[PDB]
Structure 1
Amino acid sequence: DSLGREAKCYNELNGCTLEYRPVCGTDGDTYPNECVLCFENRKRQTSILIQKSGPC
């Protein structure tokens, strides 16, 4: 109904980069980085977007 911005993985790698760059998902949750939000959507077969960067 709303939204903004899709979280990107490194597809050419199946683990993430270890930087701390929290993202606020459209779900109300904080993700340590974007790659995390992506792997979580993959596993969960979910489609959570990034609400705002930084923490919720």
Structure 2
Amino acid sequence: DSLGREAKCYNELNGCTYEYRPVCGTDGDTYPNECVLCFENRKRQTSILIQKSGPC
């Protein structure tokens, strides 16, 4: 019945910031932060979203 939420990268940077802000992906996995999920979508050519913020 609902939502979603896509993870964003810094494009002007081809690295990630070093903060700990776990995000729960639609896959059932935990990402240390959001840029991490984005960099993993990009390299893996996946399209995982953010279930809920914080850990799974």
RMSD between superposed Cα atoms in Å: 1.4
- Once the 2 structures are TM-superposed, how far is the Cα of residue 3 of structure 1 from its aligned partner? 4.5
TM-score, normalization by structure 1: 0.95
Name the % identity. 98
Contact 1:26 1:49 in 2 (8 A): yes
TM-score, normalization by structure 2: 0.95
Contact 1:9 1:39 in 2 (8 A): yes
Aligned length: 56
Q: Write out the 4+ residue segments of structure 1 that deviate beyond 4 Å after TM superposition.
A: none
Q: Is there any run of 5+ residues in structure 1 with no aligned partner, and where?
A: none
Q: Is there any run of 5+ residues in structure 2 with no aligned partner, and where?
A: none
